[PDB]
Chains A and B, each alone.
With several copies, the nearest count.
Chain A
Amino acid sequence: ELSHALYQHDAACRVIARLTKEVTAAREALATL
């Protein structure tokens, strides 16, 4: 349970890294438009 969690945690953590940079791209795009 510890191993499956820590793996899936840092896996789910990479979802945020991706999500944050796309969210950020939507801001300057709309802002500059």
Chain B
Amino acid sequence: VDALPYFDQGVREAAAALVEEETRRYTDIMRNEFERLAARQPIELLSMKRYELPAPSECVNNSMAQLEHQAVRIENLELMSQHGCNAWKVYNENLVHMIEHAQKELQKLRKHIQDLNWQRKNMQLTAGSKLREMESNWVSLVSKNYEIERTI
């Protein structure tokens, strides 16, 4: 389990082959039905392709539709312009308050994680020394036990 990242400063292609060799060894209603069918089939349901084309010389109705629609557009255009005319930028003001809040979080997350990493790093250097102390003492016995036997 234990593998020191910060301390171990000192093969990937080699170790990959040895790991490779051990792997050689080893809730909605009807809505959901038509939505999943539309995505699976890759086909969007056709809308009213009628209003744009039409033809001069049933059309008494189609004409009276157009007049009302045009009136609504003027009414909507005035309403839309009226909203756009003063609001045109109101949304932008709100969108800038919404954006800056996300990047404040980005910093708060950035600061915690950095601290954690630093902690880990510091922690390592502690033990890597202790392991260095152990190995030096290990090599001392190794030759000490020999030089004791050589003389006997």
Task: List residues of A whose CB falls within 8 A of some B CB.
Answer: 7-8, 10-18, 20, 29-31, 33
Give the residue of A15, A17, A30 whose beta carbon is less than 8 angstroms from that of B2: A15
- A12 near B145 (CB under 8 angstroms)? no
- State how many angstroms separate the Cβ of A25 from the closest Cβ of chain B: 10
Which are the 4 A-B pairs with shortest beta-carbon distances?
A11-B22, A15-B3, A14-B3, A11-B3
Contact B142 A30 (CB under 8 A): yes
B11 in the interface, Cβ–Cβ < 8 Å?
Answer: yes
> CA separation between A18 and B8, bound complex, in Å?
9
Within 8 Å of chain A (Cβ to Cβ): is B95?
Answer: no
How many pairs of residues, A versus B, come closer than 8 Å at their CB atoms?
43
A17 and B26 within 8 A (CB): no
Indicate whether B127 reaches chain A with its CB closer than 8 angstroms. no
**What residue in chain A is nearest B11 (Cβ atoms)?**
A17
Knowing A17-B11, A30-B142, A31-B145, say if A10 contacts B19 (CB, 8 Å). Answer: no
Contacts of A7 in B (CB 8 A): 23, 26
When C-beta atoms are compared, the residue in chain A nearest to B146 turns out to be: A33
Contact A11 B5 (CB under 8 A): yes
Contact pick for B19, options A13, A31, A33, CB 8 Å: A13
> Smallest distance from the beta carbon of A6 to chain B beta carbons, Å?
11
CA distance A11 to B19 in the complex (A): 6
With a CB–CB cut-off of 8 A, which chain A residues contact B23?
Answer: 7-8, 11
Given contacts A15-B18, A18-B8, contact A10 B26 (CB under 8 A): yes
Interface residues of B in 41-64 (CB under 8 A from A): none
Check: B1 CB closer than 8 A to any chain A CB.
yes
